[PDB]
Amino acid sequence: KDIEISASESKFILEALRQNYRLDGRSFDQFRDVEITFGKEFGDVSVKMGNTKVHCRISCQIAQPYEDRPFEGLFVISTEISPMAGSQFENGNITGEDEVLCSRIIEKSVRRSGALDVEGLCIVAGSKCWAVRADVHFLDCDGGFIDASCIAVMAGLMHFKKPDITVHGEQIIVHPVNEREPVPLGILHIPICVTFSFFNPSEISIIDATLKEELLRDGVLTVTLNKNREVVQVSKAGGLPMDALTLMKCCHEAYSIIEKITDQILQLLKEDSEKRNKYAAMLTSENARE
Amino acid sequence: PRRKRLADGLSVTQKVFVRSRNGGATKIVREHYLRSDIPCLSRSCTKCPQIVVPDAQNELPKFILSDSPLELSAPIGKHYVVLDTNVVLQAIDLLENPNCFFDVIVPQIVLDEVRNKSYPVYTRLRTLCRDSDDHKRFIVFHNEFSEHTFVERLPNETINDRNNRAIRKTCQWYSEHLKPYDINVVLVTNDRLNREAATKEVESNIITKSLVQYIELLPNADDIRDSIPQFTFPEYYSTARVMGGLKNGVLYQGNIQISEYNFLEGSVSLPRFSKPVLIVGQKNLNRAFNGDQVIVELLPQSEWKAPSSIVLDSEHFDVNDNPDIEAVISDKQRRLLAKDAMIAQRSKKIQPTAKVVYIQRRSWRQYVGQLAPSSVDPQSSSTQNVFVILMDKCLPKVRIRTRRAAELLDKRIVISIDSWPTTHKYPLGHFVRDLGTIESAQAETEALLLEHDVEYRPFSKKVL
Amino acid sequence: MSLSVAEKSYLYDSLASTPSIRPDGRLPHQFRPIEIFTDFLPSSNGSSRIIASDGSECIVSIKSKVVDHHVENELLQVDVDIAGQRDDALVVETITSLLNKVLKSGSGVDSSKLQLTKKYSFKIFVDVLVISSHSHPVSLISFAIYSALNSTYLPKLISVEELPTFHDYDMVKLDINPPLVFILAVVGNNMLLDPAANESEVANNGLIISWSNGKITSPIRSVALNDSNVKSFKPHLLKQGLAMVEKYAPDVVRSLENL
Amino acid sequence: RLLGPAAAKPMAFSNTTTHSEQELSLHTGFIENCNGSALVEARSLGHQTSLITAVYGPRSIRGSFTSQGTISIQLKNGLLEKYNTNELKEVSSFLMGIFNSVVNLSRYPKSGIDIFVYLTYDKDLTNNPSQISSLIPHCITSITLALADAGIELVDMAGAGEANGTVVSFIKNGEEIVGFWKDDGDDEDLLECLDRCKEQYNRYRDLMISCLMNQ
Amino acid sequence: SVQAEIGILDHVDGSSEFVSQDTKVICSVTGPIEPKARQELPTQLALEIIVRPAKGVATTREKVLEDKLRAVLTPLITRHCYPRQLCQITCQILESGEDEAEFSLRELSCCINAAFLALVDAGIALNSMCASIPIAIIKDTSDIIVDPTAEQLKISLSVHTLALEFVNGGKVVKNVLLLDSNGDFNEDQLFSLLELGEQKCQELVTNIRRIIQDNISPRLV
Amino acid sequence: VITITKRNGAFQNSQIVTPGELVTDDPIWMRGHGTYFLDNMTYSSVAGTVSRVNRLLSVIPLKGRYAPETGDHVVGRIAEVGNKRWKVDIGGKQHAVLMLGSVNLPGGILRRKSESDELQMRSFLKEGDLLNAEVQSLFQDGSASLHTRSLKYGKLRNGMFCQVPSSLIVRAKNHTHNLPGNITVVLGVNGYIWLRKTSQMDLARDTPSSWQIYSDENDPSISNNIRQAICRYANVIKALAFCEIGITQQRIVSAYEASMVYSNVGELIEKNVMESIGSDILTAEKMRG
Amino acid sequence: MSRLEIYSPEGLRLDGRRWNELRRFESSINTHPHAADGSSYMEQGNNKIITLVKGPKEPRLKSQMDTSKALLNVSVNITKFSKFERSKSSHKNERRVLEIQTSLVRMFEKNVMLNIYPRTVIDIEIHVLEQDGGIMGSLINGITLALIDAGISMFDYISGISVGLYDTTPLLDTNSLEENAMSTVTLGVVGKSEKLSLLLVEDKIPLDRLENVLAIGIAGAHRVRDLMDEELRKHAQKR
RNA sequence: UUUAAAA
RNA sequence: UAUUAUUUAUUUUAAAA
Ligand SMILES: [Zn+2]
């Protein structure tokens, strides 16, 4: 019930790496071309980078805040993997290493690192708050699971819109989405994950390994940056021991990637906003005088 | 009473104390490290430069206290000054005077008590230390961390008794530590009980004088003697009590309109009188916001006041208060509140006054304002309680908890009040939205429309 | 380790004899050497560690919570966690249900000694962590919760009804009579006290007896020690075992309350 | 759906709004899924008890090489008077220590026997405020009935009785004790507990054979 | 009009994507593959049906959605020519296209059409063809409508899911695979929509046959 | 009575090399256990003393399980009956394997066809049975291969089992010895000891097939004084192990006679009496001879 | 406690230490001889950890047997009383434990020579009795010392240290209060080398500030290796 | 609780 | 009967002639 790699295939891919050759034709520091597609409802995002395809789905509901932080909203994320992305995955295996690590990294990047404005999700302190949920669906597994999932969640949160709320003394009314247009969430910074795969025949490091390269891997490193030159999160455990010089090279190379991907999400959101707001030029209330 | 030796001169003990909060107990244990490399920071000292250690930026500590202090009359002569919590909170303005204090020692236990009771005062005290130069010199001696000055707690000893004793042990050590250089240590405390306990400690005699006694001994006493400085809301009535009170002509219903230039004077228009009924004071307003429908109860003619003739807003009132205050006086407010008391005594316009006893409808909404820089820790990424100065001057300060106080600084934000119980001095709100930077044309206009419930959102798509 | 059927019949015939030939050869009333540590968890109101002779180890922690007894039923909760076993295991839920009966507020433990105001009282959280176990550890845990409750310090109360306040430094000592649990193994017609690992494997049945206030108290059980040789016992053996603990329990309390 | 809204609270009934003989009924053989069935009901004073016991066995365990059989007893809540799951499993381990001394285990090598007791209704009609002790004797009689109906060999019948929280299970017409359970109660009392339970044991020992010999 | 694609996923034997109104369902099929010990059938093929919601985790709602989707695909597959083998059919609901808390017929209908197309792309032996449509009747004017919108469901008296089996060029209705009805209706309304549905499914397979032929024909020679 | 040692306050009461450090830079060496080769230099993988024998460079760690070697009279317990072999618990890193063609079968060979090989083995050698055998050879991973191809090795009975650390077994010519009181000790070099009543074979063979040895039937009549003698032997053997004293034949009978002072063996479990008997042997024998 | 000074201008922290001073480090070996093959009672500051290594032994079931190396299983048990407030078990709190356990397995499976022990398993049972910041680093130190006690062959030491960055000042061995007020980096340094086997950054840190934090992190971790190494010297010479 | 007009 | 065996294989000595 697992993937079988022949000895010749393992030797060919590794020797190709020793000759600066990747089967797909990318460089060692080249990220796969990401493609963001937005659905009908808000918070519906499908990410395609190479043969890897992931689909995200944002939702929210009124919930009880944590008693330790009565002024913050909750953030939930589930990254279960179905046999759809490959028969090597068992359906119902929620506690798998890939599922746990993917959830924890996006959770640290979004919730813990302040990417999502949880204080803006506060309705009534200590009682009512927004619980923004992010569902991730692994459609086709060709490596880069957490890299694609982090782009899907961050694109979904910036594309998602929550119902409106009016403060009337001690009363609070939630407008239906059919009456008033929903309000977008608060997104401070945009964290993007970049995973590095290491090999040894003098070590070789490739960015965003495919499924075949991921299986012949000797060590994995995940970094998360934003356009503000901040290191949102780093996860490296085991594998080939590395030093501070190799990491900083990974972070500087990843910053060149996350900066371009950030500008793409901002541009692709702007294009999607205009597509669904054709007659928005007539409905403007706040207008300039003369 | 445990203690363990570690590296060179380093030892550690176990600090245990019980914390009572919301009727619940929590035993708290903390590591307390005692060290012997803390300098006296006196330029005259020739025993501490040999034990100092550079900081994280590899920089040796500069010795601040002058080698030729102010020489007073015998037997004081050359002396350093050590303060307690009371003097720092009371005469903080006198400390900033350039013709008063010159070489002052602020111990750690005093600095911690000031920060716990007034953060803006603690900040101005650290500023005296940081800005020490030729005419002003302030230091902080970490007496609680020094192996020589740290004092264990005695059985059944008051919490204030130990901290008062820690101040004495600090002066006793400084007195002995500076004997070679012929410099005395003058302890300035207003606690008469603390000074008497210092006279009983014959093992190390120190000089203790009050604030008025120390000022009179200065050479320029005739010039600085004129600058010396000298709660719970009543619960709301029951719903049954306000029913019979309105029925039997005891209570009255109306809407509070806080005065234009004074956030502590409100008037309620009643059909019985031609002049609106004044409500003066915090206790009489009883946690009411401008625009609420309240229930008032008339006060006797012994308490009737005149319309106030002073200007007050939340920003210029109780500026030295912490937001989390629950169940420190400025000299400027003393000279201001007592000044208005003379007007309400000699005035003829004394009209009936009442007090709020019940809130019927809260006029709360989304208010716009900015954070008070006096209560923000610019380098802290932890949850901290900060003040919010609302745009509407008729409203008080709002306390909110936020972990982005540094980021939200110099921003124009939106909040909404959650509650205001009898025990809290200030209302509790929460952050909802950030509009932009202060004095930004895009943010100030949007903050203006929100402050007047102006619908600036685009028209509905059903309008098409 | 396990035991072969050859040596199983060797111990049965030697233990059931009128001169009880114990494996280590002790008397049917002698216990094994025990090491007990106390007061090592600063974050807890009370703590204790006990190490049995066969390497068995148990750690107990005691936390406190201010609760309104008019709405909180049980003021003493026991939470057991055996290493290498799930939290919903049968061997864990049985001891958890049994230890909450020996330490039930108002029964084995009087709720008056941990009360505060007329409205409020203290709730004791007894958390058990069994690191190693070779036999039924309900008797070894009872010794650990004994030494921990007799070294527990709770915050002193400072005293119209309002929420209670406590002093900053001074704390009171928890004076509660902590019940004790003993395990008895019957091998034929002989009653054994504190059975070892191999001894409890050939026993015909077992007895659990509580002990509080210098007398036998509820609850008492007769759970089996091994599903192989489960034999019914004569009621005179139940009386002999119930009377044997009365003869040697004060020797335990005296050797256990010294701390 | 299931569970329902989390914001809902269960109904609360206030006590201040408006204000010898132990009956027994036995049946057996009525569940087609299992081998042996049983249904015992008892209503004395203001406490009515009705529980159902099913026996699924003997089941041949694949790959097992045990010499004797293994008994698995599991108590399960029903619809009224729900007990905590920890105390239910405590009575299960106490019951397994009883039937392992009664059921002929050597007659079932490489196999196991699974017992299922359903406390479907435990009514209590006290006027104004362990309660599980009043059901242990009724559960022991129910399992012995279903074990006998399932063709499983049982060395003598097994019954028990309650005496103020004291539950004692006898065998061989009370000659030897097979189980002892006592919660709450008083001190010194023991001779009267073993006597009141023994006469209650003989009352159940012959009444079980009554319905087992008829039908 | 409905949209559908084939062979979209790489690491599975057969995939598809079915779209109707706003309901989008991506389905994948992998088989025959090695079954688990608790799955193998001695004589025929075993099926593993999995449907996952667009939001939240898989609840009991999708469990009855699996059981209905299983009852449709099981007679539609020649299970006996794959003894001791496994087929994994996984449906992923991208957008529900309806109120999930109230209705689930628009998702069941799309999962049937997505699973059938994915089974065609995978190469599993199918006994025939299949089509599924949702049917509803409006409260005020008791009118039968085929493929109702999300707003029409909230104003309907009863909802229906009709799944038919087509043989011989998509003209002969061999059997009625699934007819799931909930709401208020009598015997006259049943055969009125059943007759109406038989001709709307008849033009669906005619359009489905065109969809799959436009994709499989360029693959073959 | 109970002896409860109480403590309050805290939680509890040649060249040495550590894993990672350099032991030598001489390439002319043969690396042994606790030692790994790297970059023409030699490093340590455990924490212990450096050993040098001819050219074999190794590190002997402090704590370590029993390392089986060829020709060891061990005592092991059967874990499972596997395919054409047994898994016997010797006490090492892995279970030792006992092949079918390495024991004295009851009827000489298998009686087939009827049952499989595995099921027929459980009739006389089931799981949990205790026996003794000799390590015939070793596998590449270090696993031991046992054999019972002599009347000396068989299935143990008529006694009690005890366990001591493997390092505390002094090497000698004889593995099992006869003891006063009609008792025979089986000092397994792996740390497993079997104290039993002296049988007809070990008494008549050390002084100057059939399935009768695979019988689980114990001896019918054992003297009540002989069984109580085994307890004292077990208590003094575990006492010498508590005092980290090597176990030999003379030190067993020396502690057996020195334990007469304590009458019944009930007080032989305390640590004060254990350290006394251990110190009485280490001083009155090593300093007197 | 209350509002405190994190790093005073006098270079003193809230607990009295300085920027490069570690908490008290009291380690112990062979604390559970009759319950495991390797034992280590780690007491780093107020952190109290019990690490038990059981192996190499035969797997209980052949479903977890590797014919070329040993299997490494790390079980981290965080007691309900590890903090002040007795924490109740949360469904979300179980995910953070699995991430730590996996990070520990992947860390030590590369440093422990599993090839020398084939067809075996090595169970690592951990019990956290009290935590006060830097718990991830202290878990590493307990595993390293417990594996050495069990005689398991390793390539070198693995030292765990936690570094915090406050404004522009890095701080070594962060406690619970300091972690609540700054960003924290945990490191897994291999022996005296500058090689990392673990690097967890769970809070925002500027990129230009990360280079220096790692240097001071690997440096302070060498000091942790010395404290662990010396404890093994004293325990070997006295026995 | 700022009159009126155009914005 | 380890030059023996395990079949969707728990074998962990298949080497020499
Ligand atoms: Zn000095």
With an 8 Å Cβ cutoff, is B12 touching chain G? yes
Q: Which CATH number fits domain B365-439: 2.60.40.10, 3.40.50.2000, 3.20.20.70, 2.40.50.700?
A: 2.40.50.700
Query: Which residue in the block uniquely carries the two structure tokens 């356990």?
Result: G101
The two tokens of residue F208 are: 């100057």
Contact indicator for B396, B313 with CB cutoff of 8 Å:
no
The residue of B30, B64, B143, B159 whose CB has the most chain G CBs within 10 angstroms, and thus the best one to mutate to test that interface, is: B30
Q: How many angstroms separate the CA atoms of E43 and A244, rounded? A: 60
Bond from prior residue into B458 cis (ω within 30 degrees of 0):
no
State whether G52 and C131 contact (CB < 8 Å).
yes
CB atoms within 10 A of CB A211: 21
Chains D and B touch (3+ CB pairs under 8 A): no
d(CA F273, CA F284): 16
Query: Residue F173, SS3?
Result: coil
Reading across the β-sheet that carries E129-138, which strands appear in turn? E144-146, E129-138, E156-167, E172-182
- How far, in Å, is the centroid of ligand 1 from the Cα of F119? 87
Residue found by looking up tokens 């606790």 in the block: F34
Whether E125 and E179 have beta carbons less than 8 Å apart is answered as no
**Distance between CA atoms of F181 and F203, rounded to whole angstroms?**
12
Q: Do D194 and C235 touch (CB under 8 A)?
A: yes
Secondary structure tally for chain D: helices H, strands E:
3, 8
- Of the options 3.40.50.1820, 3.10.20.30, 3.30.43.10, 3.30.230.70, the CATH number for the domain spanning C1-259: 3.30.230.70
Backbone angles phi, psi at E153, to 5 degrees: -65, -35
In 3D space, the residue among E32, E38, E107 whose CA is nearest the CA of residue E69 turns out to be E107
**Which residues are paired to C173 by β-bridges?**
C153
The CATH number of the domain where G87 resides is what?
A: 3.30.230.70
Q: What is the CATH T-level fold of the domain F14-66, as seen in this structure?
A: OB fold (Dihydrolipoamide Acetyltransferase, E2P) (2.40.50)
Q: What is the DSSP letter of G155?
A: S
Task: Kindly tell me the burial class for residue A212, based on how many C-beta atoms sit within 10 Å of its own C-beta (0-12, 13-18, 19 or more).
Answer: middle
Preceding omega of C219 cis (within 30 degrees of 0) = yes
Q: Which residue has the tokens 């006259």?
A: E188
Question: Residue E183's domain is classified under what CATH number?
Answer: 3.30.230.70
Mutation target vs G (from F94, F139, F143, F271; most G CBs, 10 A cutoff): F94
Instruction: Report the C-alpha gap between F63 and F49 in whole angstroms.
Output: 12
Q: What are phi and psi of B223, to 5 degrees?
A: -105, -20
CA–CA gap between residue E89 and residue E49 (Å, rounded): 5
Distance separating alpha carbons of residues G71 and G69, to the nearest angstrom: 7
B260: nearest nucleotide, CA–C1' criterion:
H1
Residue C187 and residue C181: Cα distance in Å, rounded?
20
User: Considering the domain A1-290, what is its CATH architecture?
Assistant: 2-Layer Sandwich (3.30)
Instruction: Name the burial class of residue E219, with classes exposed (0-12), middle (13-18) and buried (19+) by CB atoms within 10 angstroms of its CB.
Output: exposed
SS3 E34: coil
Q: Are E89 and E50 spatial neighbours (Cβ–Cβ below 8 Å)?
A: yes
Annotate D148-173 with b (16+ C-beta within 10 A) or e (fewer). bbbebeeeebbbbbbbebbbbbbbee
Cα gap D78→D100, rounded to integer Å: 26
Q: Does G182 sit within 8 Å of B56, measured CB to CB? A: no
Amino acid at D194: L
Of the candidates B352, B231, B368, the residue with the CA atom closest to the CA atom of residue B286: B231
Distances in Å between the Cα of G3 and the Cα atoms of B115, B162, B373, C214, D20 are 7, 20, 17, 50, 70
b/e burial code for range A97-129 (CB count within 10 A of at least 16 → b): eebbbbbbbbbbbbbbbbbbbbbbbbbbbbebb
- Tell the residue number behind the tokens 């010039």, with chain if given: B223
The single residue listed with the structure tokens 């020195």 is: F258
Instruction: Give the position of tokens 């500069």.
Output: B62
Residue whose tokens read 């320029």: B220
C167 interface with B at CB cutoff 8 Å:
yes
Q: Please give the Cα distance from A80 to A102 (Å, whole number).
A: 10
Number of C-beta neighbours around residue E81 at 10 A:
12
**CB-CB under 8 Å, C4 with F8:** no
Q: CB-based burial of residue A25 (10 Å sphere; 0-12 exposed, 13-18 middle, 19+ buried)?
A: exposed
CB distance B295 to B252 below 8 Å: yes
Task: List the single residue in A39, A85, A133 with the smallest CB-CB distance to E94.
Answer: A39
What is the arrangement of strands in the sheet containing D176-182, beginning at the earlier edge strand? C190-193, C180-187, C205-212, C215-221, D176-182, D166-171, D159-163
Token readout for F182 is 């009609």
Residue B28 phi, psi dihedral angles, 5° rounding: -115, 125
Contacts for B288 with CB less than 8 Å, ≥ 6 apart: B256, B266, B279, B294, B356, B359
Q: Which residue is nearest to nucleotide I2 (CA to C1')?
A: F99
Q: Which residue type is seen at D202?
A: N
Q: How far apart are CA A203 and CA C70, in angstroms?
A: 68
In whole angstroms, give the CA distance from residue A50 to residue G209.
Answer: 34
Helix (H) or strand (E) holding E163: strand E156-167
Q: Name subunits touching E (3+ CB pairs < 8 A).
A: A, D
Q: Which of 49-88 (E) contact A at CB < 8 A? A: 50, 52, 54-57, 88
Of A114, A124, A169, the CB nearest to B418: A124
DSSP letter assigned to residue F267: G
Q: How far from each other are the two terminal CA atoms of chain F, in whole angstroms?
A: 40
| Nearest CA distance, C117 vs chain B (angstrom) | 11
Tokens of F142: 């270090």
CA dist., res. C24 & res. F265, Å (int): 7
Task: Report the distance separating Cα C181 and Cα F130, nearest Å.
Answer: 35
d(CA A175, CA A181): 9
Burial of residue B15, with CB atoms counted within 10 A of its CB: 0-12 exposed, 13-18 middle, 19 or more buried: middle
CA distance G203 to chain B (A): 11
F92 CA vs I12 C1’ separation (Å) = 14
Ramachandran sector of residue A126 (left: φ over 0; alpha: ψ -120 to 50; beta: rest): left
B353 φ, ψ to 5°?
A: -125, 150
Helix (H) or strand (E) holding C236: helix C235-256
CA torsion through residues B328, B329, B331, B333, sign: positive
C contacts of B29 (beta carbons < 8 Å): 42-43
Under 8 Å between Cβ of E92 and E58: no
Report yes or no: C237 and C222 within 8 Å, Cβ to Cβ.
no
CB contact residues (below 8 A), chain B span 32-61, against chain G: 32-35, 38, 53-57, 61
B23 → closest Cβ in C42, C66, C167: C66
Query: Is the separation of the CB atoms in G137 and G143 below 8 Å?
Result: no
Residues belonging to chain F? 289
B363/chain A closest Cα distance in angstroms: 5
Q: Are F148 and F133 in contact (CB under 8 A)?
A: yes
**Residue F1, SS3 per DSSP:** coil
In angstroms, rounded to a whole number, what is the distance separating the alpha carbons of residues B114 and B124?
11
- B257 is near strand H: CB distance < 7 Å: yes
Protein-proximal positions, strand I, CB < 7 A: 1-2, 4-6, 10-13
- Topology of the domain covering D1-215: Ribosomal Protein S5; domain 2 (3.30.230)
Give the separation between CA F76 and CA F131, rounded to whole angstroms: 6
Question: By residue range, what is the domain housing residue G176?
Answer: 1-239
Strands G121-130 and G71-78: what pairing?
parallel
- Partners of C79 on chain G (C-beta within 8 Å) are 80
**Nearest residue, CB atoms, C163 vs list B16, B23, B153:** B23
CA distances to B197, B263, B364, B426 from B290, rounded to whole Å, are 51, 9, 9, 15
In this structure, the strands spanning A192-199 and A219-225 are antiparallel
Which residue, D96, D194, D206, is CA-closest to D156? D206
CA separation for the pair C218, F24 (Å, rounded): 68
Give dist(CA E70, CA B370) in Å, integer: 60
Write the DSSP assignment of D18-84 as a string of letters: -----EEEEE----SSSSEEEEEEEEETTEEEEEEEEEEEEEEPTT---SS-EEEEEEEE-SSSPPP
Q: From A91, which residue of chain E is nearest by alpha-carbon distance?
A: E50
- The dihedral of CA D139, D143, D146, D149: what is its sign? negative
Look-up of token digits 């090695």: E34
Q: How far in angstroms lies nucleotide I17's C1' from the CA of residue E150?
A: 83
Q: Is B413 exposed, middle or buried (0-12, 13-18, 19+ CB in 10 A)?
A: buried
Element (H, E) at D209: helix D191-213
CA distances to B347, C58, C101 from C212, in Å: 79, 21, 12
Q: Contacts of residue A82 in chain E, CB cutoff 8 Å?
A: 50, 52, 90, 92
**How many Cα atoms occupy the beta-carbon half-sphere of D27 within 13 Å?**
8
> Hunting for tokens 């942790």 — which residue is that?
G224
Q: Smallest Cβ distance to B29: which of C42, C64, C170?
A: C42
Way the structure was solved: X-ray
Any idea which residue has 């009461």 for tokens? Answer: F13
- Which residues lie across from G17 on neighbouring strands? none
Tell me, what DSSP letter sits at residue A270?
Answer: H
G76 in Cβ contact with G101 (< 8 Å): yes
Give the sign of the dihedral formed by CA E61, CA E67, CA E71, CA E72: positive
Query: E99 in contact with A at a CB cutoff of 8 Å?
Result: no
For C247, the token pair is 């003869």
> Which residues contact residue A23 at a Cβ distance below 8 angstroms, ignoring those fewer than 6 apart?
A13, A16, A210, A212, A213
Q: C159 CB contacts (<8 Å, ≥6 apart)?
A: C117, C165
- Determine contact, residues A243/G195, Cβ cutoff 8 Å: yes
Rounded CA-CA distance D77/B361 in Å is 50
Q: How far is the CA of F71 from the C1' of I17 (A)?
A: 29
Tokens of B391: 């745009």
Interatomic distance B430 CA / H4 C1' (Å): 42
- Measure the CA–CA gap between B23 and C67, rounded to whole angstroms: 9
- Output DSSP code: residue A111: I
Rounded (10°) CA dihedral A46, A48, A52, A55: 0
**Residue G164 to residue G161: CA distance in whole angstroms:** 10
Nucleotide nearest to G119 (CA to C1'): I12
Q: Report the DSSP pairing between strands B137-141 and C180-187.
A: unpaired
Spanning CA of F148 to C1' of I4, the rounded length in angstroms is 17
Q: F131, F103 in Cβ contact below 8 A?
A: no
**Residue C76 pairs with which residues in a beta bridge?**
C124
Cβ pair B25:C66 closer than 8 A = yes
Q: Using CB atoms, which residue from G95, G104, G214 is nearest to A103?
A: G95
Q: Cβ(E83)–Cβ(E175) under 8 Å?
A: no
The beta strands (E) that lie in chain E are given as: 3-6, 14-20, 23-33, 45-52, 85-95, 129-138, 144-146, 156-167, 172-182
- Treating both helix axes as pointing N-terminal to C-terminal, what angle do E187-219 and E105-122 enclose, rounded to 10 degrees? 30
Strand D111-124 relative to strand D70-77, pairing: parallel
How does strand A122-124 pair with strand C205-212? Answer: unpaired
Resolution of the model in angstroms: 3.1
Taking the CB of residue F249, how many other CB atoms lie within 10 A of it? 16
- CA of B12 relative to ligand 1 center, distance in Å: 22
F102 touches strand I (CB under 7 A): yes
Cβ pair A125, A68 in contact under 8 A: no
CA dist., res. A261 & res. A225, Å (int): 11
Q: How far is E94 from chain A (nearest CA, A)?
A: 8
Neighbours of G135 (CB within 10 A): 22
